[PDB]
C-alpha cells in the first residue's frame, strides 16, 4: 500500500484517482491519497471547479518512486513531482496520516475493475506515448492531440500512439489490394503484432491506455485511437483465439465502466455496429455484445 501526499489544496477542484473521485473545497485541508494498491499503474486527475474544461492528470506507478502533488499558482494547476529524499518523504507521509488528512483509495475487495481495465498497461509503454523523460510520471489532458492528428502542431505535447490507417501503403500490399482491404489480417498480424507491437499484450496495453484517456480526459484523439485498434482486430478474418477471448473481456469492462451519460461522443456508432454485427468477429464478442445491447441499444 502506497501514498501520494498533497502539499495543500489552494483551489476548489474535483480530484480523481483511477475510477474514484472526491470534491475538495478551496483551502480545505486535504493532503493526499493513501492505500493505493501496488502492482498496477494509476492516474490522478483534476477538474477545477471554475473551469469545467481541461481535465488533466498524471499516470504513475508507485514502484518507480515517491510522488506527490503540489498546486502551482503561476501555472495554475496541480503538478505531480518526485521526492528523491526517501526519509524526508516517509516523514511527510507519516505525519499526514497521524493527523488523518488523507483519503483511502476506496477499493472494494471483490472488485477487479481497475485490474481489468489496466491488465496490459505498463508504465514504460506509457512514457513512450507521452515522451517527457525527465519525469517518471506522465501528464495527459483534454486537449492534447495525437501524432496522426497533427499530420492532417507542437510535438512536445503529442500522444505518440501507433499510427493506424486502413488506406495506407503500410496497410495494403501491392497486388493484394482488394484482399488486404477486405481482410486486414496481414496488417494486424504481420505489420502490427509481429512488426511494431511485438506481441498482443503491448497492443492491448496501448488499446487500454487510449480508452482510459478518452474516458478520464475526454481526449478525442484517444477515442479515435481506441476505435481504430478494435476495428483492426474485428476486421481481420484470422485472429489468434486467445486475443479474441481477451478482447471480449477487455471491451466488456470498458463498456461496463463508461459513464452512462457519455455514450454519445465516446462510442463511434459505425465501428461498434460493424464490429458486433458485420465483421469477421461478429460472433466472438459475446459478453461485449450482450452488455452493449442491454445498456446502449439506441446506438445500435
Amino acid at each position: 500500500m502506497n501514498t501520494v501526499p498533497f502539499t495543500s489544496a489552494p483551489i476548489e477542484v474535483t480530484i480523481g484517482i483511477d475510477q474514484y473521485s472526491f470534491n475538495v473545497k478551496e483551502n480545505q485541508p486535504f493532503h493526499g491519497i493513501k492505500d493505493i494498491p501496488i502492482g498496477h499503474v494509476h492516474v490522478i486527475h483534476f477538474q477545477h471547479a471554475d473551469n469545467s474544461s481541461m481535465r488533466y492528470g498524471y499516470w504513475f506507478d508507485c514502484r518507480m518512486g515517491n510522488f506527490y502533488i503540489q498546486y502551482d499558482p503561476k501555472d495554475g494547476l496541480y503538478k505531480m513531482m518526485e521526492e528523491r529524499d526517501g526519509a524526508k518523504f516517509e516523514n511527510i507521509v507519516h505525519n499526514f496520516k497521524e493527523r488523518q488528512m488523507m483519503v483511502s483509495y476506496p477499493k472494494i475487495d471483490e472488485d477487479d475493475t481497475w485490474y481489468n481495465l489496466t491488465e496490459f498497461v505498463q508504465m514504460d509503454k506509457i512514457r513512450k506515448i507521452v515522451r517527457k523523460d525527465e519525469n517518471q510520471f506522465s501528464y495527459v489532458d483534454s486537449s492534447m492531440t495525437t501524432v496522426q492528428e497533427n499530420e492532417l502542431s507542437d510535438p512536445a505535447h503529442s500522444l505518440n500512439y501507433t499510427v493506424i490507417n486502413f488506406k495506407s501503403r503500410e496497410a495494403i500490399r501491392p497486388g493484394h489490394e482488394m484482399e488486404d482491404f477486405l481482410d486486414k489480417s496481414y496488417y494486424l498480424n504481420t505489420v502490427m503484432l509481429q512488426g511494431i507491437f511485438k506481441n498482443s499484450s503491448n497492443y492491448f496495453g496501448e488499446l487500454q491506455f487510449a480508452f482510459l484517456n478518452a474516458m478520464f480526459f475526454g481526449n478525442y484523439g484517444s477515442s479515435l485511437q481506441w476505435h481504430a485498434m478494435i476495428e483492426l482486430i474485428c476486421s481481420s478474418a484470422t485472429v489468434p483465439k486467445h486475443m479474441l477471448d481477451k478482447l471480449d473481456e477487455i471491451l466488456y469492462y470498458q463498456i461496463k465502466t463508461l459513464p452512462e451519460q457519455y455514450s454519445d461522443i465516446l462510442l463511434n456508432e459505425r465501428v461498434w455496429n460493424i464490429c458486433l454485427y458485420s465483421s469477421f468477429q461478429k460472433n466472438s464478442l459475446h459478453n461485449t455484445e450482450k452488455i452493449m445491447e442491454n445498456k446502449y441499444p439506441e446506438l445500435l
Binding site: 488506406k167 495494403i172 489490394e177 482488394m178
Partner: protein, 237 residues
Amino acid sequence: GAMNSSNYAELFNNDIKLFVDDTNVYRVTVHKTFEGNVATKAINGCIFTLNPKTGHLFLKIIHTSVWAGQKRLSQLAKWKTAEEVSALVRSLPKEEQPKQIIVTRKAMLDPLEVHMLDFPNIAIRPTELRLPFSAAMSIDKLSDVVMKATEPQMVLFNIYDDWLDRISSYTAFSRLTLLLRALKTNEESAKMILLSDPTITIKSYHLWPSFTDEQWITIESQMRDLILTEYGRKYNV
C-alpha cells in the same frame, strides 16, 4: 470534393481529369435452369474512362473469362475496375496522367483510392451529377467491339468525333450527355432519330452521323422533346 452543378465548368479547364464509369463492367443475363432455378450468364463488359475535355475514351473491355471461378462478382467488379484504371494511369507518360479522377458511382471510391495509393497527388472524387454513361453500350460501335472481343483488350476512341473542330469542350460534353440521356430513356426512339435520314452517314472512324451544324440543332431539339415526353409518361405529369 464532390462534383455538382456548381463546379461544372472545372471539367473544361486545362487540368487533365477523367471520368470513370463502372456500370457496364459486370453484365449478366438472368435465366431459368432445367430444374427451374435462376442462374446468370455473364457477357463481356467494359470500363468507360473518358477525358471530358479532349473526348478521348479509354474503352477497356472486360472479358467474361475474368469472372471464372470467382465469388462476389459484383464486388470484385469494382476492384477489377480500380485495378484497370490504375494500370491505365501507370501506362500513361507523367505529363498525361490525370490530376483528378471522377468516379460516377460512390462505391468505386475506396477501391480506386486503394489501388491508387502510389499516386497520392491524383484526387479521387465522387459526383452529384446523374451522368448517363451507362447508355454507352447503346452506341452501336462500342457495343460491337465489346461483344466481339475474345480477350482483354483496350480500344481507343474520341467520343466527340470531330466536333471540337467547331464547338467547345463545354458544348461537346452537353451534346454527348444529351444524346446519352436520350438513348438511356428510350433507346428505340433515340436511335430512330439519329438514323432516320439514310443520306447522313457515320464515318468509318467516327461514332455518330456527320450532321451539319443546322442538322445538329434539329437533332438536339428532337432529343430534348424525347426526354420530356418520357418524363410525363413515367410520372403521369
